[PDB]
Subunit: 131 residues, 3 copies
């Protein structure tokens, strides 16, 4: 078990948690009410900040059910949460349905957060690859 | 020098997903159905397979690059997350992001790729603030 | 400890770099100027080729700033760069804003590249999840 320090910037939301055992991610809540008309986007506060360990990355993924049912997606998916980042996690939701709005209420689960190792590669410039 | 991934062909008529080259990150998933997507429209497509992602790992459903450029095919929830506990059929939320040309998916077409990666099953520890936790000062 | 070999196919762009220590991605440059009208897409050259090590994968992710501010996205995100690939990295940009075109100039940072280990799992066909001792889990076929 890797530990992850989290601050509830919004104390009124539940702490993100694993929907089932072995699940890859924890769901993030919206701190806000917002309505997305077809094709529109918004940057939604989640009410949390995290300290992803050095050598790791946090990844913000859309939820499948809302994706199919209403066309909810994320413009920068997967969103990359860097180890050094100590601000509020924000989710760039977009409505990809052509005709119907998406209604987001505060306290809805709008995205999921995974933590993974990342290779912090040193780039080494070469003149050519070995053919 | 990795593990196996157990896979069921719920639809025995499709080929088993396979890793085309030894280093390729993903195995391609096929469509079990015919579906036509008009511009801007989406569908939830069955792949005909179920997998058993190992505990401590995750399955990741990513788009194929060719179809993305050639016709604007995308996946609404990309990257799709396949959890270790899930034993249902993998489904792909396809969308046509081209403004004008319909995309026709045929049964047997490759529509996505499935990667498997380790994931950290984190224990969240609530802190009152970062300065007060002893871990503020960063690069950002 | 891991290095990534990289060739600047376009010698007039900087080598990609990490914006801050610990950051997961290096930012990729556009080699070209492109204007994307609402809903249109382009395949944009970055001027670099890389050699992802066997056992790893390169992943091309959108940058959050441009995504939120102008609706810039990547059609096949996350773009998968395989260990066997030695061609130029190309980015399938798309303008998801309904009204405003996006202008990209040569030298702009239009995406970021992560490298991660990948599990090169050996697929084994089984008859069913019950017969493989695998039908006992937290979800079943729910989700
Ligand atoms: O964002 C990307 C993604 C891929 N690529 C390159 C790297 C990679 O290994 C290669 C193939 O990726 P896909 O499998 O996603 N495309 P597709 O399955 O259509 O073609 P192929 O038959 O080559 O696998 O294209 C990029 O340059 N940028
Ligand atoms: O979905 C996201 C993605 C990023 N972020 C925060 C966390 C991260 O470390 C940071 C930067 O992400 P990007 O590198 O994708 N954005 P960009 O390159 O535009 O800005 P920067 O100069 O900060 O890296 O923004 C979010 O809150 N939500
Ligand atoms: O692209 C996908 C994504 C997920 N899935 C399956 C696998 C996964 O374990 C499951 C749940 O995924 P999400 O957590 O993204 N969906 P949601 O949060 O809507 O449903 P649930 O309440 O079950 O978690 O659905 C697919 O078949 N295809
Ligand atoms: Mg879920
Ligand atoms: Mg491929
Ligand atoms: Mg950045």
């Amino acid at each position: 078990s890797t530990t992850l320090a989290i601050v509830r910037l919004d104390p009124g939301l539940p702490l993100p948690s694993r929907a089932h055992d072995g699940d890859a991610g924890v769901d993030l809540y919206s701190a806000e009410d917002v309505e997305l008309a077809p094709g529109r986007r918004a940057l939604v506060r989640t009410g949390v900040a995290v300290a992803v360990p050095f050598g790791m990355v946090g990844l913000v993924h859309p939820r499948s059910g809302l994706a199919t049912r209403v066309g909810l997606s994320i413009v920068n998916s997967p969103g990359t949460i860097d180890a050094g980042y100590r601000g509020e996690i924000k989710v760039a939701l977009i409505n990809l349905d052509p005709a119907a709005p998406i209604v987001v209420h505060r306290g809805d689960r709008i995205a999921q957060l995974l933590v993974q190792r990342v290779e912090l590669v040193e780039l080494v410039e070469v003149s050519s690859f070995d053919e």
